[PDB]
Amino acid sequence: GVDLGTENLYFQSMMHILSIGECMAELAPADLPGTYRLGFAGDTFNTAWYLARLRPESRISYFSAIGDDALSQQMRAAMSAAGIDGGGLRVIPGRTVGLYLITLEQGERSFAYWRGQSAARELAGDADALAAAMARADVVYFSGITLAILDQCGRATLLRALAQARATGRTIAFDPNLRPRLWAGTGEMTETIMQGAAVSDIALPSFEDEAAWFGDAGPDATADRYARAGVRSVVVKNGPHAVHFLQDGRRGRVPVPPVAQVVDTTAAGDSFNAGLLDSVLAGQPLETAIAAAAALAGQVVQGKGALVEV
Amino acid sequence: GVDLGTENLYFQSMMHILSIGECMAELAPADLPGTYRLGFAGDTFNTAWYLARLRPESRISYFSAIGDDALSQQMRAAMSAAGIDGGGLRVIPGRTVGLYLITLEQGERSFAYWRGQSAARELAGDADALAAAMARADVVYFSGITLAILDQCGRATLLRALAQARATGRTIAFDPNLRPRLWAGTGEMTETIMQGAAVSDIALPSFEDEAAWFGDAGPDATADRYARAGVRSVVVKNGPHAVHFLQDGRRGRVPVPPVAQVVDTTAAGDSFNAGLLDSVLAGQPLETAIAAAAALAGQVVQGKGALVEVP
Ligand SMILES: [Cl-]
Ligand SMILES: [Cl-]
Ligand SMILES: [Cl-]
Ligand SMILES: [Cl-]
Ligand SMILES: [Cl-]
Ligand SMILES: [Cl-]
């Protein structure tokens, strides 16, 4: 299946990025009326999918938990087909995966979801498995959805594993991705997101999504908030507006070219994150990485669905 | 929409059957690989669907709760299109419906479902709405899935409403339909099922689904179990084998004629129940109703999908 390359004690033949979170089954409108196509999505998985297309010579791993039913097996097979390393997936017997259903009526999309009992909510049940997945990753990526789906013990287990990996030299990247409906309380949400910030080197907040919850006056305030948690590189997405960044005390802005013919903004942020991390792994300056990120996101906005072939 | 007929204080122009439970969104493999066709099903809804086709001149009502999203609206529309009266459906803002997905693995059907947070779990949250739906029903039908999805208060409320309806002359019909995964424990399951039996005039157990869980030595033991709970008419389904019954101390058997080609047994039990209740509502003797139930079920077994169009 997926080529993992080779290694010695010191280096691996492939650059290695691990994404941790929930991959969702997804039913999306098909052509033939009343029908839907089964695919797979979910924020951190979307990011992994874009990364595997940007750098197919690298090792893009996904860590999560799935069930042992047919649908879970289809999910595993889809990861492999997409060039994603799912070797570390954990299997939770008696559970299945989460699901999105997208409906399309007179050209308007809406969605429903079922994920309150998904296997992925157990992804932090085995601390040793988490540590092993991270051990030789160049970058470890996770999101606020990754945090939201876990109970407090699982949140703590994940945060501890990230801190430990960070201390051994793993670069930790975080997409706060606030989704209020996935949290049982507001304070828990904002506090837990900032716990995620405290173990991360790179953070990719969105001003529009976060300002209300934290009281950020503007994107520079958002950046300051993450820097105070120890984040070394903060890259603040703000829709069609210039991307503000803050890195070790230094601010800058990167303009975002206007995007005509908007089709579907789904996964715009996930793909931005992939473009940024791809460029960072390639050793490009932060400003160059941000420009690349915006360029990819614009093409995803112009395309339909979570996984756009750009 | 659906014609509900007329009424005076004493009689309604249509015979009235109420089915209470959860209707599920359902996706099943379609013609192109990786694609699935959306429809609606769920045990007690299936039964209502078959009833509406058997007696399209009658009023077949469905009581449940749905959300306020697009899928819930499609479900409501599908009920109306099927000739089912969904006028009593409750709407629970911010929630959606339950869903199951059928996939194939080496040609074999696999099922996944998502219903732990469905709106239908709130169907007994309003006691007065429940009572009102039952008030002028000739028959009120519910299942063990109806019981399983409710919390303790909801189960109590439903059983209370069923017993009160029974006492005012409404005929109560129950399909135990054991689904162990929907229950927090096997103790809660068996006990709650028999609480369902205790408010029911008619019970439609399946020997194949229940025997091992209750320790029934045979279909006659199944029947005895329901009679002890006060069920007046127990009709025991047993796959392709003879249907045993027990009514007010009298036993009998009704042959099930062999099925030419078994295509899909989905909803065979639901359709049997519809055929039985249709005939009972028409005032036919129990043995006659059982033959009719077995005849419809046989046609559903020969057909694909939960909802088989049988003339
Ligand atoms: Cl070596
Ligand atoms: Cl949300
Ligand atoms: Cl929470
Ligand atoms: Cl830099
Ligand atoms: Cl069902
Ligand atoms: Cl079950």
DSSP codes joined into one string, B186-253: HHHHHHHHHHHHTT-SEE--BHHHHHHHHT-SSHHHHHHHHHHTT-SEEEEB-TTSPEEEEETTEEEE
Task: Name every chain B residue with its beta carbon within 8 A of the beta carbon of A101.
Answer: 25, 71, 99
CB B230 within 8 A of CB B214: no
CA dihedral for A110, A116, A119, A124, sign (positive or negative): positive
CA distance B304 to B25: 17
Other beta carbons within 10 Å of A163: 13
Helix (H, G, I), strand (E, B) or coil at B258: coil
- Please provide residue A38's backbone torsions phi and psi, each rounded to the nearest 5 degrees: -85, 125
CA distance B62 to B85: 6
The two tokens of residue B150 are 């409710």
CB A89 within 8 A of CB A63: yes
3-class DSSP string for A120-186: HHHCCCCHHHHHHHHCCCCEEEEEHHHHHCCCHHHHHHHHHHHHHHHHCCCEEEEECCCCHHHCCCH
Task: Name every chain B residue with its beta carbon within 8 A of the beta carbon of A68.
Answer: none
CA distance B187 to B281: 34
Q: Which residues of A are annotated as a binding site for Mg(2+)?
A: 54
- Residues, beta carbon < 5 Å, ion ligand 6: B 179-181
DSSP letter (8 states) at residue A309: -
User: Alpha helix (H) ranges present in B99-151?
Assistant: 127-134, 144-148
Smallest Cα–Cα separation from A301: which of A247, A262, A243, A252? Answer: A262
CA distance A125 to A123: 6
Long-range Cβ contact pairs of B308-311 (< 8 A, separation 24 or more): B308/B267, B308/B271, B309/B53, B310/B50, B310/B53, B310/B271
The two tokens of residue B22 are 């959860």
CB A241 within 8 A of CB A256: yes
Smallest Cα–Cα separation from B134: which of B83, B63, B231, B199? Answer: B63
CA distance A161 to A175: 17
Picking from B24, B35, B117 by the largest number of A CB atoms within 10 A of its own CB, the best residue to mutate is: B35
The two tokens of residue A153 are 């013990």
Q: Is B38 annotated as a binding residue?
A: no
User: What is the four-CA torsion angle of B158, B161, B167, B172, rounded to 10 degrees?
Assistant: -40
Going by their DSSP bridges, the two strands B59-63 and B84-85 should be labelled as parallel
Contacts of A167 (CB under 8 A, 6+ apart): none
Q: Which residue type sits at A139?
A: V
Q: At what angle do helices B152-167 and B186-197 cross, to 10 degrees?
A: 20
User: What is the four-CA torsion angle of A216, A220, A225, A226, rounded to 10 degrees?
Assistant: 130
Q: Which residues pair with B233 in a beta bridge?
A: B202, B247
Q: Which residue type sits at A247?
A: Q
From A35's Cα to the closest Cα of chain B, the distance in A is 4
CB A226 within 8 A of CB A257: no
CB B236 within 8 A of CB B223: yes
Half-sphere exposure of A11 (CA within 13 A, CB side): 3
From B97's Cα to the closest Cα of chain A, the distance in A is 9
Q: Is A112 on the interface with B (CB under 8 A)?
A: yes
Do A114 and B96 count as a contact with CB atoms less than 8 A apart?
A: yes
CA distance B84 to B72: 15
CA distance B78 to B87: 13
Q: Which residues of A are annotated as a binding site?
A: 54
Helix (H, G, I), strand (E, B) or coil at B163: helix
Q: How remote is the CA of residue B308 from the centroid of ligand 2, in Å?
A: 39
Q: Which residue type sits at A19?
A: S
Do A96 and B112 count as a contact with CB atoms less than 8 A apart?
A: yes
DSSP letter (8 states) at residue A233: E
Do A99 and B114 count as a contact with CB atoms less than 8 A apart?
A: yes
**Residues in chain B after which the backbone breaks (C–N beyond 2.5 Å):** none
Interface of B with A in 160-199 (CB under 8 A): none
Q: How remote is the CA of residue B179 from the centroid of ligand 6, in Å?
A: 4
CA distance A100 to A112: 6
Q: How remote is the CA of residue B173 from the centroid of ligand 6, in Å?
A: 22
Question: Which CATH number is B1-311 given?
Answer: 3.40.1190.20
From A211's Cα to the closest Cα of chain B, the distance in A is 24
Query: A239 in the Ramachandran plot: left (φ > 0), alpha (ψ -120 to 50) or beta?
Result: left
CA distance B295 to B293: 5
From B183's Cα to the closest Cα of chain A, the distance in A is 13
How far is CA A179 from its chain centroid? 13
Task: Name every chain A residue with its beta carbon within 8 A of the beta carbon of B37.
Answer: 34-36
User: Alpha helix (H) ranges present in A2-151?
Assistant: 43-54, 70-81, 127-134, 144-148
State the burial class of residue B179 (Cβ atoms within 10 Å of its Cβ: 0-12, 13-18, 19+).
middle
CB B146 within 8 A of CB B158: yes
Do A32 and B34 count as a contact with CB atoms less than 8 A apart?
A: no
Q: Does domain A1-310 have CATH number 1.10.540.10?
A: no
Helix (H, G, I), strand (E, B) or coil at B280: helix
Closest in A32, A101, A116 to B32, CB measured: A32
The two tokens of residue B149 are 């999805």
CA distance B39 to B45: 12
Q: How remote is the CA of residue B115 from the centroid of ligand 6, in Å?
A: 13
Interface of A with B in 84-103 (CB under 8 A): 96-97, 99, 101, 103
Going by their DSSP bridges, the two strands B59-63 and B139-143 should be labelled as unpaired
Length of chain B, in residues: 311
- Residues, beta carbon < 5 Å, ion ligand 2: A 179-181
Which uninterrupted H or E stretch holds B105?
strand B98-105
Q: Which residues pair with A18 in a beta bridge?
A: A61, A140
Q: Resolution of the experimental model in angstroms, please?
A: 1.6
Whose tokens are 């906005």? That residue is A301
State the burial class of residue B31 (Cβ atoms within 10 Å of its Cβ: 0-12, 13-18, 19+).
exposed
Query: B94 in the Ramachandran plot: left (φ > 0), alpha (ψ -120 to 50) or beta?
Result: left
Experimental determination technique: X-ray
The two tokens of residue A305 are 């669905």
Contacts of B242 (CB under 8 A, 6+ apart): B253, B254, B255, B256
Q: How remote is the CA of residue A225 from the centroid of ligand 3, in Å?
A: 21
Closest in B69, B71, B110 to A70, CB measured: B110
Do B99 and A99 count as a contact with CB atoms less than 8 A apart?
A: yes
Picking from A32, A35, A118 by the largest number of B CB atoms within 10 A of its own CB, the best residue to mutate is: A35
Task: Name every chain B residue with its beta carbon within 8 A of the beta carbon of A114.
Answer: 96, 99, 114, 116-117
Q: How remote is the CA of residue A182 from the centroid of ligand 3, in Å?
A: 7
CA distance B281 to B292: 12
CA dihedral for B116, B119, B120, B124, sign (positive or negative): positive
CA distance A91 to A94: 9
Smallest Cα–Cα separation from A23: which of A150, A118, A160? Answer: A118
Query: Which chain A residue shows the shortest CA-CA distance from B69?
Result: A112
